[PDB]
């Protein structure tokens, strides 16, 4: 009904707090009420997507007022991807398991829709204004730049993931040269 799901939402939101204790298994979801698992991950991803949208909006409402410098498209895309990836820092230990869960042959539609919506927001808050076939290429040309970059962060050991950010540079420049 209404209260059922409206409270299951709070159940999941409170359960995903102490995930560094157990993991994305079905043990922390039920134990969170004291305060597989193929829904906790989707809920976490949706929440982080919404918060990224909100942060980009709060930042855009500053450049249309003054007191906020402007910058080219490549710099903005690098900053957006860095901002979105800096949310996976506390949960970085048990992430590859959730990434495996997200790629099973029956969860690909949902995950792909979430990725498409994230990329769409990230491009629209950068001034795309394109009604052509270029609506697709650019989107795709960014999804890769995201996915690949993620597959580095889980295996990097450099201080504050600095190495990873450097990769982003050497992966977006080649894109902005018609890659």
């Amino acid at each position: 009904y209404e209260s059922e799901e409206q409270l299951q939402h709070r159940i999941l939101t409170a359960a995903l707090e102490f995930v560094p204790a157990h993991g994305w298994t079905a043990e922390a979801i039920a134990e969170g009420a004291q305060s597989d698992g193929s829904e906790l991950i989707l809920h976490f991803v949706t929440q982080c997507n919404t918060r990224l949208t909100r942060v980009l909006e709060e930042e855009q409402k500053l450049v249309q007022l003054g007191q906020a410098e402007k910058r080219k498209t490549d710099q903005f895309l690098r900053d957006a991807v860095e901002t979105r990836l800096r949310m996976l820092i506390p949960y970085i230990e048990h992430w590859p398991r959730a990434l495996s869960i997200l790629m099973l042959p029956h969860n690909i539609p949902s995950s792909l829709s979430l990725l498409t919506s994230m990329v769409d927001d990230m491009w629209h808050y950068a001034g795309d204004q394109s009604t052509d076939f270029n609506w697709y290429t650019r989107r795709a040309m960014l999804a890769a730049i995201y996915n690949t970059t993620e597959l580095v962060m889980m295996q990097d050991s450099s201080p504050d993931f600095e190495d990873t950010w450097r990769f982003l540079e050497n992966r977006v420049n080649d894109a902005m040269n018609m890659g």
Binding site: Y1, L104, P105, H106, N107
Partner: protein, 165 residues
């Protein structure tokens, strides 16, 4: 509005037919063994569900899907394809198909309480009872998970294709 209450009956009939056929296959292979009665009980439950949806389909004068002669060779091939890999290879098929059925029953009872919740409940209580009886025993190996997903992702295209066509 009749197409909305038509597509649901058609896809439910198709899904229950497919499940009945799968259990018929698995019973044909693992018949005279120590795992017979479980498959027999599940087969009887699915025959009951099929008879109910069959009379409910005859009543409302709806159109059965055209692919029904195709779930008859693909609903029996996954009754000798699996269930020859041993017990733990047959348990991983029923769980998958029943989880798919329950997920679609949920998705189908969602869009029928938010659009018109008062012109019904001669049919909605049936869907709720069927979801409960289908999920009651769906709860009862790192590779046997993948094999389950590739079966749970086939019973989701066979539902996408069977309601439109």
């Amino acid at each position: 509005s009749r197409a909305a209450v038509d597509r649901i009956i058609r896809v439910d009939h198709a899904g229950e037919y497919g499940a009945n056929r799968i259990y018929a296959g698995q019973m044909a292979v693992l018949g005279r063994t120590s795992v017979g009665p479980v498959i027999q009980k599940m087969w009887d439950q699915e025959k009951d569900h099929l008879k109910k949806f069959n009379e409910l389909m005859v009543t409302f004068r709806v159109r059965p899907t055209v692919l029904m002669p195709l779930w008859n060779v693909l609903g029996f091939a996954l009754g000798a394809g699996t269930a020859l890999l041993g017990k733990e290879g047959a348990m991983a098929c029923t769980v998958a198909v029943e989880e798919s059925i329950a997920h679609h029953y949920n998705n189908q009872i969602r869009t029928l309480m938010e659009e018109d919740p008062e012109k019904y409940e001669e049919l909605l209580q049936l869907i709720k009872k069927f979801r409960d009886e289908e999920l009651e025993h769906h709860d009862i190996a790192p590779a046997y998970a993948v094999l389950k997903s590739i079966i749970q992702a086939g019973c989701r295209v066979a539902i996408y294709l069977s309601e439109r066509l």
